[model samples]
Target: NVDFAKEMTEFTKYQIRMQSGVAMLAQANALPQLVLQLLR
Candidate 1:
């Protein structure tokens, strides 16, 4: 029998990881602009 709960759990984990990575990249990209704004 297929384990639907296990599959869903893995999918949720993957989504969370993907979102975390995107957020980190966004922060990294925005860091330079933030620093510039602070300097100004």
Candidate 2:
């Protein structure tokens, strides 16, 4: 039980980090798309 809780704690931290990472990635990708639109 202790190990399970420990594992979950780590999982929670990593998932939140990954979620935020993806959100930032989308914005970064959109910025380039804006430049592409200007090119066309």
Candidate 3:
């Protein structure tokens, strides 16, 4: 018998980490557009 709760806990942790990485990449990509707006 597998422990479903323990498996879900690990999956949630991995998802959160993946989301943060994507958020960071998004901010990095947005910075250039922000600078262009400031110049305009």
Candidate 4:
């Protein structure tokens, strides 16, 4: 159950700030891993 809408919103913000689409998508996809790291 991917929250595409939420992800897209964040993605767009990154794009507006001149971030690359590939980078944004990759970062978005790794969000779960990031959360786990923060929990440790």
Candidate 5:
């Protein structure tokens, strides 16, 4: 369960600042993988 739209709201602004960039992307992208591995 995730809030894709809400996440995208920040992502839209991310286009402006682009701070954290790949750092944020890696962590956010890690969420699903982390949870999936634990669940498995």
Candidate 6:
């Protein structure tokens, strides 16, 4: 059975995960070039 709540949970989880991933990458080092790519 398809659960709407479960799907929404996963969507939100991935959004948070991706947001944190970008933040971590930015803080890791000089990320100007990488940030440019991400901006696109």
**Which has the better TM-score: candidate 5, or candidate 6?**
6
lDDT of each: 0.75, 0.78, 0.75, 0.74, 0.70, 0.77
Candidate 2 residue-wise lDDT, 1-40, digit = tens = 9999999989877766779877566556656777989999
lDDT per residue, candidate 3, 1-40, as tens digits? 2588889968967776789887566556656878999999
TM-score, one value per model? 0.36, 0.36, 0.36, 0.32, 0.26, 0.36
Candidate 5 runs further than 4 Å off? 17-40
- In order, how many clashes per candidate? 0, 0, 0, 0, 0, 0
Across residues 5-31, which tens digit of lDDT does each residue of candidate 4 receive? 888878777675786767666566656
Best candidate according to lDDT: 2
Candidate with better TM-score, 3 vs 5: 3
Segments in model 2 whose C-alpha atoms lie over 4 Å from true places: 21-40
lDDT of 5 by residue, 3-22 (tens): 98889877866764676676
Residue pairs with backbone atoms closer than 3 Å in model 3 (clashes)? none
Q: How much lDDT does candidate 2 score? A: 0.78
- Find the number of clashing residue pairs for candidate 2: 0
TM-score-superior candidate, 3 or 6: 3
Error of 4 at 38 (Å): 42
**Which segments of model 1 are wrong by more than 4 Å?**
21-40
Evaluation by lDDT, superior candidate among 3 and 4: 3
Each candidate: RMSD:
10.4, 10.7, 10.4, 8.5, 6.8, 7.5
Backbone clash pairs for candidate 2 read none
Q: Give the better candidate number (1 or 4) by TM-score.
A: 1
lDDT of 3: 0.75
Cα lDDT for residue 31, candidate 3: 68
